[PDB]
Design an enzyme around this catalytic site. Structure first.
Site, PDB file in Angstrom:
ATOM      1  CG  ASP A  99     -17.401   8.242 -10.179  1.00 24.68           C
ATOM      2  OD1 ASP A  99     -17.135   8.346  -8.964  1.00 24.68           O
ATOM      3  OD2 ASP A  99     -17.938   7.137 -10.427  1.00 24.68           O
ATOM      4  CB  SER A 109     -12.430  16.122   7.285  1.00 23.31           C
ATOM      5  OG  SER A 109     -12.498  17.566   7.532  1.00 23.31           O
TER       6      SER A 109
HETATM    7  O1  LIG Z   1     -21.338   5.909  -6.410  1.00 25.05           O
HETATM    8  C1  LIG Z   1     -20.368   6.848  -5.924  1.00 25.05           C
HETATM    9  C2  LIG Z   1     -19.723   7.458  -7.337  1.00 25.05           C
HETATM   10  C3  LIG Z   1     -20.901   7.983  -8.150  1.00 25.05           C
HETATM   11  C4  LIG Z   1     -22.117   8.022  -8.212  1.00 25.05           C
HETATM   12  N1  LIG Z   1     -22.520   8.347  -9.335  1.00 25.05           N
HETATM   13  C5  LIG Z   1     -23.905   8.864  -9.813  1.00 25.05           C
HETATM   14  C6  LIG Z   1     -24.260   8.910 -11.130  1.00 25.05           C
HETATM   15  C7  LIG Z   1     -23.077   8.956 -11.980  1.00 25.05           C
HETATM   16  C8  LIG Z   1     -21.799   8.466 -11.598  1.00 25.05           C
HETATM   17  C9  LIG Z   1     -21.463   8.346 -10.194  1.00 25.05           C
HETATM   18  N2  LIG Z   1     -20.395   7.921  -9.468  1.00 25.05           N
HETATM   19  N3  LIG Z   1     -20.003   6.999  -4.988  1.00 25.05           N
HETATM   20  C10 LIG Z   1     -20.342   6.414  -3.469  1.00 25.05           C
HETATM   21  C11 LIG Z   1     -21.803   6.565  -3.204  1.00 25.05           C
HETATM   22  C12 LIG Z   1     -22.368   5.619  -1.933  1.00 25.05           C
HETATM   23  C13 LIG Z   1     -21.234   5.114  -1.286  1.00 25.05           C
HETATM   24  C14 LIG Z   1     -19.820   4.782  -1.844  1.00 25.05           C
HETATM   25  C15 LIG Z   1     -19.321   5.728  -2.826  1.00 25.05           C
END
Ligand SMILES: O=C(Cc1cn2ccccc2n1)Nc1ccccc1
EC number: 3.4.23.22
Length: 330
Positions: free
Chosen positions: A35, A199
Site C-alpha cells: 500500500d 498530472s
Molecule cells: O487509504 C488509503 C490507502 C488505502 C486504502 N485501503 C483500503 C483497504 C485496504 C488497504 C488500503 N489502503 N488512501 C487514501 C484514501 C483517502 C485519502 C488519502 C489516502
C-alpha cells in the site's frame, strides 16, 4: 541488495493485490496488500480477536525466535474506505522477494474492522508511503522500504500491477524489460506523507487532451481512480446511460456498454487506461448495472491515482534524497 516478488489480484475484478511476505524465524508467509498510500506494516495475528478472524493466515510471534515485543508500543489506523485496525508491535525479520530487513516493526492486530475480517485473502498491509505517516506510538516506526533503502542497489521500488493477471513489485532496481519506451519522471511532494504528484491533464477516448494540473497520490492500496468531478463527468458523459447514483455511491453504467479509454498526463508523456480497466462489474450479482472504475474525489479531499490508473503503467517510486515518481507505458 534487491528483491522481487509477484503480486496477484485477490479476485476477478482486481479489487486489490496480494504479495507474499516472509515474517519471523522460521518464516511465516503472509499475503499482504502493498500500500503506497499508508505506512504501517500490520498483520492478522495470534493476538487478533478470534471473532474478527475468518480465513486469514495469522502471524504468531511466540513461534518466531527473532520476534521481540516492542515494549509499550501501540498502533491504530484508519483508511479512506472507512476501515480500521489497531494493536501492539513486535520487531522481527521480514523478507520480500529475497530482500531481508532485520528489526522491522511488525504491527500485530488486536482488532480489525469488518471489511478486513470479511476479506479472507488479505492477511495484512505493507505500507510504502513515507514513514512520517506511520501510526506507532509513542515511537514512530519506519516502513520496510525505509529500512531497506540504504542496502538497496538503488533507493527505489517499482510497481507493475497486472490487469486480471499477476504483476511484480521490485525493490532496488529498475527492470528495463518490463516497460516500453522511456520512463517519465515527475516531482513529488512528501508534505502530506504520500507519493503526491501533479498530472498534466487528461483525455477521454480518442478526444483531445485537456492540459490541466491534477494533484493526486499514487496509491496502490486504493482500487479505483478518483479525480475531480469535472473530469469524471466528462468521462462518463461519453458512456450512454451512465449516471451518478447516490444510492449505489458513484457512477454506474449499463453493463452492455463499451467503455472508452482514459488518458492521463505525466509531464509531456501520456498513460492510456484501456476502457475495460474501468469496468468493475455488476453492482450486485445478476444486475445489468455496472460500477465504474473512475469516480469523483469530491469529498475525499485529495485525488487518488489508484490501481485502475497504476496498473496501466510501470511505476517507479524513487526514494532518493529528493523523491520522484516515474511512469512508463508497458
Ligand atoms: O487509504 C488509503 C490507502 C488505502 C486504502 N485501503 C483500503 C483497504 C485496504 C488497504 C488500503 N489502503 N488512501 C487514501 C484514501 C483517502 C485519502 C488519502 C489516502
Amino acid at each position: 541488495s534487491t528483491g522481487s516478488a509477484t503480486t496477484t489480484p485477490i479476485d476477478s475484478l482486481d479489487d486489490a493485490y496480494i504479495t507474499p511476505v516472509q515474517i519471523g524465524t522460521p518464516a511465516q508467509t503472509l499475503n499482504l496488500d502493498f500500500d503506497t498510500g499508508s505506512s504501517d506494516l500490520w498483520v492478522f495475528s495470534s493476538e487478533t480477536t478470534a471473532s474478527e478472524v475468518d480465513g486469514q493466515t495469522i502471524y504468531t510471534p511466540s513461534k518466531s525466535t527473532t520476534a521481540k515485543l516492542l515494549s509499550g508500543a501501540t498502533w491504530s489506523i484508519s483508511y479512506g474506505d472507512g476501515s480500521s485496525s489497531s494493536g501492539d508491535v513486535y520487531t522481527d525479520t521480514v523478507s520480500v522477494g529475497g530482500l531481508t530487513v532485520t528489526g522491522q516493526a511488525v504491527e500485530s492486530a488486536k482488532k480489525v474492522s469488518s471489511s478486513f475480517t470479511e476479506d479472507s485473502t488479505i492477511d495484512g498491509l505493507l505500507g510504502l508511503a513515507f514513514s512520517t505517516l506511520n501510526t506507532v506510538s509513542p515511537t514512530q516506526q519506519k516502513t520496510f522500504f525505509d529500512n531497506a533503502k540504504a542496502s538497496l542497489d538503488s533507493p527505489v521500488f517499482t510497481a507493475d500491477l497486472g490487469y486480471h493477471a499477476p504483476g511484480t513489485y521490485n525493490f532496488g532496481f529498475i527492470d528495463t524489460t518490463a516497460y516500453t519506451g522511456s520512463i517519465t519522471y515527475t516531482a513529488v511532494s512528501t508534505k502530506q506523507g504520500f507519493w503526491e504528484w501533479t498530472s498534466t491533464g487528461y483525455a477521454v477516448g480518442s478526444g483531445t487532451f485537456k492540459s490541466t494540473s491534477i494533484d493526486g497520490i499514487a496509491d496502490t492500496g486504493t482500487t479505483l481512480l478518483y479525480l475531480p468531478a469535472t473530469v469524471v463527468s466528462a468521462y462518463w458523459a461519453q458512456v450512454s446511460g451512465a449516471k451518478s447514483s447516490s444510492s449505489v455511491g458513484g457512477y454506474v453504467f449499463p453493463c452492455s456498454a463499451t467503455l472508452p479509454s482514459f488518458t492521463f498526463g505525466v509531464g509531456s508523456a501520456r498513460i492510456v487506461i484501456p476502457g475495460d480497466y474501468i469496468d468493475f462489474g455488476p453492482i450486485s450479482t445478476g444486475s445489468s448495472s455496472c460500477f465504474g472504475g473512475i469516480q469523483s474525489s469530491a469529498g475525499i479531499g485529495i485525488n487518488i491515482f489508484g490501481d485502475v490508473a497504476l496498473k496501466a503503467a510501470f511505476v517507479v517510486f524513487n526514494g532518493a534524497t529528493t523523491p520522484t515518481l516515474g511512469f512508463a507505458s508497458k
